[PDB]
Design a protein around this ligand. Structure first.
Ligand SMILES: CSc1ccc(Br)cc1CC(=O)N1CC[C@H](C(N)=O)C1
Ligand SMILES: [Zn+2]
Length: 139
């Protein structure tokens, strides 16, 4: 689990959104596994606006933050799970690292701020849903 809190927005994995996030929906995209809902309180996360390919992510299944190299956002085939059938997920970045289903939501950060959140994984890989292209999160 986990979320990004920027301005009056809450960014979570779409598959983990609560009935309350859907009522306060701003934007969602099943193909990106992202949902953004409105908040009453102002958030303090800064979103990165960069092309960094190295960063640090939080892995809740290890209670550890790991430095990683990750690929640029791309369209990647993602195996079936209890939340989606087998499909291509867009704006996804992969890294070699540990992840379990409940790690989704953990933040990936570079020197510029938040890059994205854990969204996919398994077999020694971890995938992150990029948020750096969502320029509107800043206004
Ligand atoms: C970090 S996700 C993960 C990790 C290890 C294993 Br094995 C399997 C997973 C995959 C997983 O459960 N999902 C849920 C939905 C998500 C998606 N974005 O399609 C992928
Ligand atoms: Zn950066």
């Amino acid at each position: 689990s986990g979320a990004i809190y920027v301005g009056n927005y809450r960014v979570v994995n779409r598959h983990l959104a609560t009935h309350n996030d859907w009522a306060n929906l701003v934007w969602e995209d099943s193909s990106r596994d992202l949902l953004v809902s409105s908040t009453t309180a102002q958030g303090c996360d800064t979103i990165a606006r960069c092309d960094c390919q190295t960063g640090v992510y939080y892995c809740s299944s290890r209670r550890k933050h790991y430095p990683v190299s990750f690929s640029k956002p791309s369209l990647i085939f993602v195996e079936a799970s209890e939340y989606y059938p087998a499909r291509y997920q867009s704006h996804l970045m992969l890294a070699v690292g540990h992840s379990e289903p409940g790690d989704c939501g953990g933040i990936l950060r570079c020197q510029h701020g938040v890059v994205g959140i854990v969204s996919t994984g398994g077999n020694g890989l971890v995938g992150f849903a990029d948020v750096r292209d969502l320029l509107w999160l800043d206004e």
